[PDB]
Amino acid sequence: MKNRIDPELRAMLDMFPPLNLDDVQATRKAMEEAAQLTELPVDEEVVVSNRMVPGPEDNPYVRVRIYEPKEKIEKLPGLLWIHGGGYVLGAPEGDDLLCQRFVKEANCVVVSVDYRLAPEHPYPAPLEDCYAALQWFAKKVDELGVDASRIGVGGQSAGGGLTAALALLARDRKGPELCFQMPLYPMIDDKNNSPSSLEITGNLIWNHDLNEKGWSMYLDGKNGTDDVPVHAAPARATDLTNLPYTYTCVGQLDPFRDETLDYVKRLCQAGVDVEFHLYPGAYHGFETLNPAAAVSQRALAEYVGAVKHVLNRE
Amino acid sequence: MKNRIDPELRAMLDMFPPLNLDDVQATRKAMEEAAQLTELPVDEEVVVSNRMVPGPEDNPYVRVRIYEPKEKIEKLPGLLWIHGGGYVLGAPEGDDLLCQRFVKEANCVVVSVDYRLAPEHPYPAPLEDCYAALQWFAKKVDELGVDASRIGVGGQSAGGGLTAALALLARDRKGPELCFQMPLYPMIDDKNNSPSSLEITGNLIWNHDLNEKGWSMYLDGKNGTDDVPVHAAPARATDLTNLPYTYTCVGQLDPFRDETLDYVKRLCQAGVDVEFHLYPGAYHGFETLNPAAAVSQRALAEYVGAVKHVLNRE
Ligand SMILES: [Mg+2]
């Protein structure tokens, strides 16, 4: 698709080998080796810690990674953050730069979830870990210096899917209150049969074949069948009423373009307040892979600004 | 729920006397008298001129209003601008401030069409006047100091519908080349039956009842029937292939929300480059009516920036 891709995004596609989910163990080991080569500096304005918190009943405690301002004088809003990786890869540490940016620009506390991964822990384990982390965050607002009426949830890709699912689950459980959801370019349609999901086939970071493998591992082979609940695949939701204010965005060359457009359309029809941005010439994860690109800098500034505006509004 | 309107947009909406299209002749006479009580915006960096250009067979001359930089030392891109007004109101002069902004920020020549209005001149008259203006603009690029490979078209509301229609018509006629289309919150679906159209019924600048009247006058009572060509109502297009790079945006509380989302989706599926922004809490024409509002300033800067980016790239 070379001619369709923004020129500032092309060079990074050649710079890294196409992702492979035929060997998930090997892919995770490779990503962890990459992570060790690229360690962030300490940012002196943001204090980062890990904590073990009670998990879902009869399940392991959940690790969360907490980012807070070095100086707290007044009560702050909160953001639950959920990393991506197809439901099968990833760790909170991968998103330290962005979480530190949300703390500094939104003046908030971020709690990032180390959810269990598929295929070892399929649905509902990853979502229940996110829900346990949200319960802990709401319960500990005293100690964190947070306002429980100003907690939102956000994430990218599979983490965006878990964000949209968690907003539905917390609504349905009269669960902790959420003031905002930011399901960025979210993996929400297990059927993998939208035109955009079918069209994106090659080395464009995420594609139809990767999506098929991630959904198969998350849903233990029930992907695409009638035996998939709304909380596993939010595209299946028919009742989107009484969900939180939503910000999302997607690149037009992301396989998730069409499911994202459809979710936005249905949220608006359900009376949910939505801001949505479709970016031209842009593939999945463009803004994380190409930080120097003008379109990446516009996209990052806008969704950091959404967190700042919505979590702090009167 | 008026609580869903952005607080910065509320005060102008209560001062807005609700539009009445039961007597279009009386409404135009009123708007022209209002215009005469206020001097038109001038700008020392922009030179404004009026020209009569050959029209369709129907209307041998069409007036265009031309905005250019005071200092032209190189070849510039061009923007054909199409004002809004429901197909039944308006004149180029109403958009002088925004056309001057495109000249100054995009460093372009703007040609704004004084198209014939419905119901006196129903479809196809308004679109054929725009097409005649585009033919003249392409023909006179050497005289205007414009690059024929860098001409776009843009407009708002009914002008956005004419923009989308003119991109289809120029494609179909192998008509002058367009490098960009900017059909902002465009009036493109004559059926007036989308969920967003039925949702927006009150005093929110444009609504279901006004939309029915504008379409009935533009299409001489054939609105909603099988007797409506794609060039009269671009929502009817099934072939969106080979259309120019598109920017569009819409407020969530605009009746055009759903038809705008659906056209964006179909453009992307046809392989057209598209940027789209949905703004929360925002009604039709918010950014023109509320220049002080933060969401207005973001929206205006983004679509002025799209003109600048797309007309000057490569
Ligand atoms: Mg299948």
Author numbering:
A (entry chain A), B (entry chain B): 1 to 314
Lines quoted from the article behind this entry:
Here we determine the structure of a novel hormone sensitive lipase (HSL) family IV cold active esterase (EstN7) isolated from Bacillus cohnii strain N1 to understand the basis of cold adaptation. Esterases are particularly useful as they catalyse the hydrolysis of a wide variety of esters into their constituent alcohol and acid.
EstN7 was observed as a dimer in the unit cell, which was confirmed in solution by size exclusion chromatography. The two β-sheets are connected across the dimer interface via an antiparallel arrangement of strand 8 from each subunit to form effectively a single continuous sheet, with residues in the C-terminal helix and helix 8 also contributing. Electron density that equates to ethylene glycol was also observed in the active site of both subunits, with an additional ethylene glycol found in subunit B. Analysis of EstN7 solvent accessible surface area (SASA) shows that the second helix-loop (residues 23–40) is not tightly associated with the catalytic domain as is the case in related structures but forms a bridge-like structure that reveals additional potential tunnels to the active site not present in the closely related mesophilic and thermophilic esterases. The bridge structure is anchored by M31 and L40 through hydrophobic interactions; the connecting residues do not form any additional interactions with the rest of the protein. Surface electrostatics were calculated using APBS (Adaptive Poisson–Boltzmann Solver) and revealed the surface of EstN7 is largely negative with a few basic patches.
